[PDB]
Design goal:
- By secondary structure, this protein is an alpha+beta fold.
- 61% of the residues lie in helices and 8% in strands.
- It has 24 helices and 10 strands.
- The protein has helices at 6-12, 14-30, 35-41, 52-63, 87-99, 142-157, 171-205, 208-234, 242-273, 277-304, 312-344, 358-370, 377-384, 408-419, 441-455, 486-495, 516-532, 548-556, 559-582, 585-614, 622-647, 653-680, 688-706, 708-720; strands spanning 71-79, 105-109, 128-135, 164-169, 395-396, 428-433, 460-464, 502-509, 542-546, 618-619.
- The strands form 3 sheets. Strands 2-3-1-4 form a 4-stranded antiparallel beta sheet.
- It starts with 5 loop residues before the first helix and ends in a 14-residue tail after the last helix.
- This is MmpL4 protein.
- Keywords: Cell membrane, Membrane, Transmembrane, Transmembrane helix.
- Residues 45-375, 475-734 form the Membrane transport protein MMPL domain.
- It is found in: Cell membrane.
Amino acid sequence: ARPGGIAKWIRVLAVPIILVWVAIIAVLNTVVPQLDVVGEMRSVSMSPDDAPSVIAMKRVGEVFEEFKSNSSVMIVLEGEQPLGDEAHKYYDEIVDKLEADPAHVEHVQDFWGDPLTASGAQSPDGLASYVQVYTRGNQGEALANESVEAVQDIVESVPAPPGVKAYVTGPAALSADQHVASDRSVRVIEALTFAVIITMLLLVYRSIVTVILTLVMVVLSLSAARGMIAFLGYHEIIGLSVFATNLLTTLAIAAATDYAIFLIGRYQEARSVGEDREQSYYTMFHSTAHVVLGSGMTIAGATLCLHFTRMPYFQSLGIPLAIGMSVVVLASLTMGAAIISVASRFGKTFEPKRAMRTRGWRKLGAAVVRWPAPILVTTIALSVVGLLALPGYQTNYNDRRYLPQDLPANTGYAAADRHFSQARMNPELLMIESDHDLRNSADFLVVDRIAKRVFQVPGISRVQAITRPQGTPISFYLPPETFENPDFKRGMKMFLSPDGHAVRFIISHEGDPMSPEGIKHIDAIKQAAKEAIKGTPLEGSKIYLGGTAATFKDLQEGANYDLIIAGIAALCLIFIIMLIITRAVVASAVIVGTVVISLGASFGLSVLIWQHIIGLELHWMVLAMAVIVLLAVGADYNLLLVSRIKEEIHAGLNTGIIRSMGGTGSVVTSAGLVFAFTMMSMAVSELAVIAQVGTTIGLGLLFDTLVIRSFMTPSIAALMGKWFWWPQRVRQRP
């Protein structure tokens, strides 16, 4: 703990460091609009540009020369009276104003305006109708969001008939309203988070000056991280998703508070022993700076490991989170060290106010070292009972239930569900692109065969084709005289390619295409079409199938494998960081394995609460987003405890554990409580996925703070003895 190294440089350059950090924070906050504005502008596609569903939909748009993007929303009309006179008119002005805005609307698939296909766009009771309009964008980008906003504005501009109401729904509408749901509760999230942290810092320190300075450090670090992320995103360097902003804000605040708590706790412990301010600061730095740096590097690397998946949301989550956490770590180490150094020499600023809680934690350490075998067994049992949630763990792929029901997309879905069957606003599009003109009598037998065979597939409730213009059935033969009928000419134009080389089918699911059963439906439809076109003068045609079910098939087929690989990479990277810091293989393995064990209890608590008490099943992204943060932060707490043990080995393996636990008990307890409660502060989010992720991470941090670091790791250390620090040389005796 001799004065020297980076600590002395920071202490002597404290004021310049603070001024430089403040200046760059101001620059990054005054040269770019804001993080929320950038995230709205730089929203990422919900699906990769090379996904089979995206390619199929763009190919359908290109062949038919209608659209070129991958965004579409459904406009549904709901009237108290049956849709009749003046309702068709209202629909007509709506579609006319839609086709007069090429900047947002690419094509309007007008089925209800055509008497041939009018019955196919109406509900059986006749009280509702819908039209699919194709907008510009890729269903998740910003451009798609302004497209949906423009469509809603156009719909609301037209005066409605006395009893007819129009809604704008669809998966693109749901994605667009995700952003507006976030940017109405993100402020509530940050306000509640700051209130919680202020209260808990007041409880921990009982000092107003210390709390104010901790808030200053946290606010400056958060502003630096958010400014860096906004600067990167605004320059189209990184992509930002809706979840990225919320997780970045909460994680930055919580991690900054944790680093401040670590530094201040070490400084105040050094002061309580009876060391002057300079030696106290030097001891704090030499004991906690590497721990904080490694703790932040673990979070940064763990979040970075998400970039290696194929899901665009997870890449948009990965790099920005890593950059934000790294900026938080620098603005914690350098800024907090400088601020502590400056403020210590201004009276009783950071001086401890109440007491230190060694005696209780020393008694707990004595209990742990006395019975290391009976303990760690209770902890393994408490961590594995969460696996009882596997027989019954249900995941939900539909984002409809994870958004407030008052959003325009949810309202439109609710209105459609009153009159139409389930998932009629999410149709599948099947295109079979041939190599010859299909507008002859022979090929319509094949087309009708395809329509009939796809309809006969279980889980398919409606197939709309040229031979079934209304989606319902009317040995087949069309006389050539039908080809000159103008009604049939319009039908072929609306269902066949302009050159006649492609045929289009609209397919509606019996159930929800969100589920993996809807994923099996895609393969069933493709196989049925391939067998239908078998042994006919149409073989070799390229089958394109696109829609919601195909999109989520492309998302989910490799998602589980990608997430497993990402988690394994995160574990490996955290283990490498622990190995670099502690220089002990066994200690690093224990640190990274205890959190893996506690993942069971975290998962059990989350699947219990959300799936049973609340009733809302866990979103299929929640575990993926939560496991990374859990592994990072639990390993960080274990790192702090293990490093403190390492500093105390010279007194003995058992006395070292006892003294280290006594030293770090209250500090790590406060840090873990702050992190967990900041994480669960997302419970007020209007994005139920965000709330689920936050509550899961908070419950996991509460569990491991109360169990793992307290009893499991110390008991493992006591059991291992000299082998805990392997292959490090161990004194092994006082």
